[PDB]
Amino acid sequence: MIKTIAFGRYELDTWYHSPYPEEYARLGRLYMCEFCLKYMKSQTILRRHMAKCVWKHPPGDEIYRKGSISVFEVDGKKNKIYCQNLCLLAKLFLDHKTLYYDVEPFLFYVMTEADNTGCHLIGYFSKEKNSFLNYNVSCILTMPQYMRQGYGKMLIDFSYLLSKVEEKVGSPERPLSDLGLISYRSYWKEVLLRYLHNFQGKEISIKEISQETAVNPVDIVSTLQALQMLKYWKGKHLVLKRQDLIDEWIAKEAKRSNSNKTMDPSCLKWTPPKGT
Amino acid sequence: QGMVEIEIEGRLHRISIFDPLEIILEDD
Ligand SMILES: CCCC(=O)SCCNC(=O)CCNC(=O)[C@H](O)C(C)(C)COP(=O)(O)OP(=O)(O)OC[C@H]1O[C@@H](n2cnc3c(N)ncnc32)[C@H](O)[C@@H]1OP(=O)(O)O
Ligand SMILES: [Cl-]
Ligand SMILES: [Zn+2]
């Protein structure tokens, strides 16, 4: 049963089982092309593949580029094989993954970091092409060798950037895993404290914050509760602008900029696909 | 008809999404 993956220059321990064919799942170690995501049986087979494989980046359209960081929009109907490979690969680290086979109704936003050999996979999020529940993320992953460096938050931030450009309010697909809820709560806090740090008025509505940030009103209210910023005095509810919370936020956001782990809206060249 | 429920300091509450809410610093 599958225990590790060879992926470019990394060797990755798998968290959960993924339904690779038994011919492969029978092995303990699976070899992957880091660019087209084909899975193979041995180092030897991979080496032969790497001599033949033309791909040096995801398929699809590069819609974000800031220096060495890119995001590629892959259509699951146009690149079924790549997206299915991506889906089997993500299930090695997702406890509960929506689906694997029918990738056609989904778009995949694949984030990469470039060096002189090509555009290497950092992570991705999928997104329903047409979601009744207005979910702007279906699943999201940062590859293990990249985890806990701020790329997950860039992926989340990017998913809301798409929503803004579509003039939509978005929300992640329920249910949220523990790692996902921690990351979303961190992002929501950042976005809420940033808005309030910049707003000079003395009253605001949830809808106003929601329409500016593309964040859903319920998650806004939920973050306000988590921050203990919803108080009750006399008859109505008030927002408590906690000094420390924004004080810690400017110190934290200083460190974020310093490390360049931010998405930059002016680096997005994108018009929403096949729905506008 | 967009409203949210939860509790603040042992008190169940209910909040509108369109009503302006007042921002404060540290007064009472
Ligand atoms: C969303 C629709 C429904 C779903 O699919 S939910 C499933 C989400 N995906 C998964 O669970 C797959 C496994 N996990 C992941 O891929 C990543 O952990 C995930 C959720 C993308 C986060 O990616 P990262 O690149 O690590 O995130 P990041 O560096 O931007 O930091 C985000 C905040 O989360 C925190 N955190 C991140 N990893 C943690 C960990 N192991 N244990 C405890 N806390 C953790 C991290 O410190 C950061 O918080 P903060 O800014 O310091 O307050
Ligand atoms: Cl390089
Ligand atoms: Zn390949």
Side-chain angles (χ1 to χ4, degrees), chain A residues 43-72:
Chain A
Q43 177 201 325
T44 309
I45 295 193
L46 181 78
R47 177 189 68 246
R48 226 136 61 220
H49 178 88
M50 300 314 294
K52 298 185 299 176
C53 176
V54 292
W55 290 102
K56 280 127 176 33
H57 59 70
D61 304 301
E62 181 179 71
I63 61 168
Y64 181 92
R65 200 257 192 104
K66 178 156 179 267
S68 62
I69 274 72
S70 287
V71 187
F72 295 78

Coordinates of all heavy atoms in Angstrom, one line a residue, chain A residues 43-72:
Chain A
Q43 N 12.0 4.5 -10.4 CA 12.8 5.6 -10.8 C 13.2 5.5 -12.2 O 13.2 6.5 -13.0 CB 14.1 5.6 -9.9 CG 15.0 6.7 -10.3 CD 16.4 6.5 -9.8 OE1 16.7 5.9 -8.7 NE2 17.4 6.9 -10.6
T44 N 13.5 4.3 -12.7 CA 13.9 4.0 -14.0 C 12.8 4.5 -15.0 O 13.1 5.2 -16.0 CB 14.2 2.5 -14.2 OG1 15.1 2.1 -13.2 CG2 14.8 2.3 -15.6
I45 N 11.5 4.1 -14.7 CA 10.5 4.5 -15.6 C 10.3 6.0 -15.6 O 10.2 6.6 -16.7 CB 9.1 3.8 -15.2 CG1 9.3 2.3 -15.4 CG2 8.0 4.4 -16.1 CD1 8.0 1.5 -15.4
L46 N 10.4 6.7 -14.4 CA 10.4 8.2 -14.4 C 11.5 8.8 -15.2 O 11.2 9.8 -15.9 CB 10.4 8.6 -12.9 CG 10.4 10.2 -12.8 CD1 8.9 10.7 -12.9 CD2 10.9 10.7 -11.5
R47 N 12.7 8.3 -15.1 CA 13.8 8.9 -15.8 C 13.6 8.8 -17.3 O 13.9 9.8 -18.0 CB 15.1 8.2 -15.4 CG 16.4 8.6 -16.2 CD 17.6 7.8 -15.9 NE 17.5 6.4 -16.5 CZ 17.4 5.3 -15.8 NH1 17.5 5.3 -14.5 NH2 17.3 4.1 -16.4
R48 N 13.1 7.7 -17.8 CA 12.8 7.6 -19.2 C 11.7 8.6 -19.6 O 11.8 9.3 -20.6 CB 12.3 6.2 -19.6 CG 13.0 5.6 -20.8 CD 13.4 4.2 -20.6 NE 12.3 3.3 -20.3 CZ 12.4 2.3 -19.4 NH1 13.6 2.1 -18.7 NH2 11.4 1.5 -19.2
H49 N 10.6 8.7 -18.8 CA 9.6 9.7 -19.0 C 10.1 11.1 -19.0 O 9.8 11.9 -20.0 CB 8.5 9.6 -17.9 CG 7.4 10.6 -18.0 ND1 6.3 10.4 -18.8 CD2 7.3 11.8 -17.5 CE1 5.5 11.4 -18.7 NE2 6.1 12.3 -18.0
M50 N 10.9 11.5 -18.1 CA 11.5 12.9 -18.0 C 12.3 13.2 -19.3 O 12.4 14.4 -19.6 CB 12.3 13.1 -16.8 CG 11.6 12.9 -15.4 SD 10.0 13.7 -15.4 CE 10.4 15.4 -15.5
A51 N 12.8 12.2 -19.9 CA 13.5 12.5 -21.2 C 12.5 12.8 -22.3 O 12.8 13.5 -23.2 CB 14.4 11.3 -21.6
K52 N 11.3 12.2 -22.2 CA 10.3 12.4 -23.3 C 9.3 13.5 -23.0 O 8.7 14.1 -24.0 CB 9.5 11.1 -23.4 CG 10.3 9.9 -23.9 CD 9.4 8.7 -24.2 CE 8.7 8.2 -22.9 NZ 7.7 7.1 -23.2
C53 N 9.0 13.8 -21.7 CA 7.9 14.7 -21.4 C 8.2 16.1 -21.7 O 9.2 16.7 -21.3 CB 7.6 14.5 -19.9 SG 6.3 15.6 -19.3
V54 N 7.3 16.8 -22.5 CA 7.5 18.1 -22.9 C 7.1 19.2 -21.9 O 7.5 20.3 -22.0 CB 6.8 18.4 -24.3 CG1 7.5 17.5 -25.4 CG2 5.4 18.0 -24.2
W55 N 6.3 18.8 -20.9 CA 5.7 19.8 -20.0 C 6.7 20.3 -19.0 O 7.3 19.5 -18.3 CB 4.5 19.1 -19.3 CG 3.3 18.9 -20.2 CD1 3.0 17.7 -20.8 CD2 2.4 19.9 -20.7 NE1 1.9 17.9 -21.6 CE2 1.5 19.2 -21.6 CE3 2.3 21.3 -20.5 CZ2 0.5 19.9 -22.2 CZ3 1.2 21.9 -21.2 CH2 0.3 21.3 -22.0
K56 N 6.8 21.6 -18.9 CA 7.6 22.3 -17.9 C 6.8 23.2 -17.0 O 7.3 24.1 -16.3 CB 8.8 23.1 -18.6 CG 9.9 22.2 -19.0 CD 10.3 22.4 -20.4 CE 11.6 21.6 -20.8 NZ 11.7 20.3 -20.0
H57 N 5.5 23.1 -17.0 CA 4.5 23.9 -16.2 C 3.1 23.2 -16.4 O 2.9 22.4 -17.3 CB 4.5 25.3 -16.7 CG 4.1 25.5 -18.1 ND1 2.8 25.3 -18.6 CD2 4.8 25.8 -19.2 CE1 2.8 25.5 -19.9 NE2 4.0 25.8 -20.3
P58 N 2.2 23.6 -15.5 CA 0.8 23.1 -15.7 C 0.3 23.4 -17.1 O 0.8 24.3 -17.8 CB 0.0 23.8 -14.6 CG 1.0 24.2 -13.6 CD 2.3 24.5 -14.4
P59 N -0.8 22.7 -17.6 CA -1.4 23.2 -18.8 C -2.3 24.4 -18.5 O -2.2 25.0 -17.4 CB -2.3 22.0 -19.2 CG -2.6 21.3 -17.9 CD -1.5 21.6 -16.9
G60 N -3.2 24.8 -19.4 CA -4.0 25.9 -19.1 C -3.4 27.3 -19.3 O -2.2 27.4 -19.8
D61 N -4.1 28.3 -18.9 CA -3.7 29.7 -19.0 C -3.0 30.2 -17.8 O -3.6 30.0 -16.7 CB -4.9 30.6 -19.4 CG -5.6 30.1 -20.6 OD1 -5.0 30.1 -21.7 OD2 -6.8 29.8 -20.5
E62 N -1.9 30.8 -17.9 CA -1.2 31.5 -16.8 C -2.0 32.9 -16.6 O -1.9 33.7 -17.4 CB 0.3 31.8 -17.1 CG 1.0 32.5 -16.0 CD 2.5 32.7 -16.3 OE1 2.8 33.6 -17.2 OE2 3.3 32.0 -15.7
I63 N -2.7 33.0 -15.5 CA -3.5 34.1 -15.3 C -2.9 35.0 -14.2 O -3.3 36.2 -14.0 CB -4.9 33.7 -14.9 CG1 -4.9 32.9 -13.6 CG2 -5.6 33.0 -16.1 CD1 -6.3 32.7 -13.1
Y64 N -1.9 34.5 -13.4 CA -1.2 35.3 -12.5 C 0.3 35.1 -12.6 O 0.7 33.9 -12.8 CB -1.6 35.0 -11.0 CG -0.9 35.8 -10.0 CD1 -1.5 37.0 -9.5 CD2 0.3 35.5 -9.4 CE1 -0.9 37.8 -8.5 CE2 0.9 36.2 -8.5 CZ 0.3 37.4 -8.0 OH 1.0 38.2 -7.1
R65 N 1.0 36.2 -12.6 CA 2.5 36.0 -12.6 C 3.1 37.2 -11.9 O 2.8 38.4 -12.3 CB 3.0 36.0 -14.1 CG 4.3 35.4 -14.2 CD 5.4 36.4 -14.5 NE 6.7 35.8 -14.9 CZ 7.1 35.8 -16.1 NH1 6.4 36.4 -17.1 NH2 8.3 35.2 -16.4
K66 N 3.8 37.0 -10.8 CA 4.7 38.0 -10.2 C 6.0 37.3 -10.0 O 6.2 36.5 -9.2 CB 4.1 38.5 -8.9 CG 5.0 39.5 -8.2 CD 4.2 40.4 -7.2 CE 5.0 41.4 -6.4 NZ 5.5 40.9 -5.1
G67 N 7.0 37.7 -10.9 CA 8.3 37.1 -11.0 C 8.2 35.6 -11.1 O 7.6 35.1 -12.1
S68 N 8.7 34.8 -10.1 CA 8.7 33.4 -10.1 C 7.5 32.7 -9.7 O 7.4 31.5 -9.8 CB 9.9 32.9 -9.3 OG 9.7 33.3 -7.9
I69 N 6.5 33.4 -9.2 CA 5.2 32.8 -8.7 C 4.2 33.0 -9.8 O 4.0 34.1 -10.4 CB 4.7 33.4 -7.4 CG1 5.4 32.7 -6.2 CG2 3.2 33.3 -7.2 CD1 6.8 33.0 -6.0
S70 N 3.5 31.9 -10.2 CA 2.5 31.9 -11.2 C 1.2 31.1 -10.7 O 1.3 30.3 -9.7 CB 2.9 31.2 -12.5 OG 3.8 32.0 -13.2
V71 N 0.1 31.4 -11.3 CA -1.1 30.6 -11.1 C -1.6 30.3 -12.5 O -1.7 31.1 -13.3 CB -2.2 31.3 -10.3 CG1 -3.4 30.3 -10.0 CG2 -1.7 31.9 -9.0
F72 N -2.0 29.0 -12.7 CA -2.5 28.5 -14.0 C -3.9 28.0 -13.8 O -4.2 27.3 -12.8 CB -1.6 27.3 -14.5 CG -0.3 27.7 -14.9 CD1 0.7 27.9 -13.9 CD2 0.1 27.9 -16.3 CE1 2.0 28.3 -14.3 CE2 1.4 28.3 -16.6 CZ 2.3 28.5 -15.6

